[PDB]
From Swiss-Prot, chains A, B:
Keywords: Methyltransferase, S-adenosyl-L-methionine, Transferase. The lineage of its organism: Archaea, Methanobacteriati, Methanobacteriota, Thermococci, Thermococcales. S-adenosyl-L-methionine-dependent methyltransferase that catalyzes the trimethylation of the amino group of the modified target histidine residue in translation elongation factor 2 (EF-2), to form an intermediate called diphthine. The three successive methylation reactions represent the second step of diphthamide biosynthesis. Belongs to the diphthine synthase family. GO terms for biological process: methylation; protein histidyl modification to diphthamide. Pfam families: TP_methylase (PF00590). Homodimer. S-adenosyl-L-methionine binds at L10, D87, V90, S115, I116, L166, A209, H234. It is an enzyme of class 2 (transferase). It catalyses: 2-[(3S)-amino-3-carboxypropyl]-L-histidyl-[translation elongation factor 2] + 3 S-adenosyl-L-methionine = diphthine-[translation elongation factor 2] + 3 S-adenosyl-L-homocysteine + 3 H(+). This is Diphthine synthase. Pathway: Protein modification; peptidyl-diphthamide biosynthesis. It comes from Pyrococcus horikoshii (strain ATCC 700860 / DSM 12428 / JCM 9974 / NBRC 100139 / OT-3). Its EC number is 2.1.1.98. The diphthine intermediate is not stable in vitro and readily eliminates the trimethylamino group. It is not known whether the elimination reaction also occurs physiologically.
Length: 265, 265
């Protein structure tokens, strides 16, 4: 009679919490989704093995349109687990799933796990200084969206950092790279010419957060736009004015040029 | 000869990630701090029992002044772990400790854990809509902190939610409740009269996130300022312009007054 929303964490099968793993093991049915994001440091097989339960994978349509016909029915008589990468309820449409559960007379509990939102603290940037977040999306056809550019502008204008998720093609497994994201932003800067993203802008690139050997790089766009950050997923951050301690971290830990100690502080 | 920063999570010893547990079990020395946050659902004993090691708890002074004398020295020959509540680098100054580790020729790694920063997702509020964060600090003698009041104003003007970390004096076993935070805010409103935080302001309270039964409440200050939300830790959130689905969740899951369903766009 219970539904558990369990986060799988950041990168591999060991990123789930002890509580989440033990609970998942005692569930009769286990579902999961990998359309909001993917566990690049592992496989479905490794996760199934660790849990010892068959994992029924669900698509975006399965979740958004038929959650109540696929998941909730089984929760009426058994304990069901729903696994998602990161922290449950972070993906904007997932909170609503708990309402569907209530309507179905099904109890639901949330088992947290690490999220990129909190994991970006490894960049040395103070968490309280982050402002609104955005997603960099690929233009397509006659559609050229640029809201993510305005978000950076609103934040930087107030001395706040901007966390940028990069467009992902879940099923086609086609991730947008930090390099690609920078190119798009430079192109958006050439149209709106607001002086928000240029070759002199300082950015931070975080890749494979959660891994024991993540890639943390900071520098000006002109030097990082062609650098190789490794395998996805990539996260882009456009910092606002830095606190000296933030700058010292980016320099000592993320190889940023000493120049930021005077230009961006 | 390495140093591991390992987060313990939100509420109890099971909120640690499997990755963190397996590594912590193999460290020669284990240190920790419990002044940056409160893990209401566990004890040092349970943690030690789960990890199978004795944990030397450090005070804020031991850490902020003598980290390189108490911890780093051992890391130069043994595998050392440093445990903290939630995620080690979120809303703390522990990131700077990685710089010290580096300067002393000690490699460090970070194992994330669920954090209050991403756990706000359980409130139903879109996490991408959160703006700058702030801390409601206890007034000290004649010094009365107010900066956190201007943060709410800045975000509200932009329609962004505001996450408010609540103060803590671990050495005195004092943990600010949401009620206390609301009282301090009304007092600041009385001084500045910016129409930022009044008895008609809608607020959200999340208490003991990470537990199976956290307290999630939403409503007007006048009605919530004297309500009992259970034991600490608590966080206070001042939402901005709400999406309809955010409001539906606050009402259906957080017991908010059906009135907020009628959103003014
Ligand atoms: N489980 C929990 N529930 C509610 N608030 C919490 C909480 N854990 C931390 N907080 C809030 O955050 C403050 C500590 S700030 C340090 C946060 C920690 N590194 C993390 O990642 O969560 C507390 O005083 C409280 O206001
Ligand atoms: Na944020």
């Amino acid at each position: 009679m219970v539904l558990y929303f369990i986060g799988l964490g950041l990168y591999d099968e060991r990123d789930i919490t002890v509580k989440g793993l033990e609970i998942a093991k005692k569930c009769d049915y286990v579902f999961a989704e990998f359309y909001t994001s993917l566990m690049a440091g592992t496989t479905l097989g490794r996760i199934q093995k660790l849990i010892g339960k068959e994992i029924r994978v669900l698509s975006r349509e399965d979740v958004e349109m038929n959650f109540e016909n696929i998941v909730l029915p089984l929760a009426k008589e058994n304990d069901v687990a729903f696994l998602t990468p990161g922290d449950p309820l972070v993906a904007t449409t997932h909170a609503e799933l708990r309402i569907r559960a209530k309507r179905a007379g099904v109890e639901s509990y949330v088992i947290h796990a690490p999220s990129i939102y909190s994991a970006v603290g490894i960049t040395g940037l103070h968490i309280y200084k982050f402002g609104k977040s955005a997603t960099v999306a690929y233009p397509e056809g006659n559609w050229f969206p640029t809201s993510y550019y305005d978000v950076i502008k609103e934040n930087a204008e107030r001395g706040l950092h901007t966390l940028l998720f990069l467009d992902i093609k879940a099923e086609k497994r086609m991730y947008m790279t930090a390099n690609e994201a920078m190119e798009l932003l430079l192109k958006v800067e050439d149209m709106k010419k607001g002086g928000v993203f240029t070759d002199d802008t300082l950015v931070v690139v975080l890749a494979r957060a959660g891994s024991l050997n993540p890639t943390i790089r900071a520098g000006y766009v002109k030097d990082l736009i062609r650098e190789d950050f490794g395998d996805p997923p990539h996260i882009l951050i456009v910092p606002g004015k830095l606190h000296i301690v933030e700058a010292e971290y980016l320099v000592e830990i993320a190889g940023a040029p000493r120049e930021i100690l005077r230009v961006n502080v």
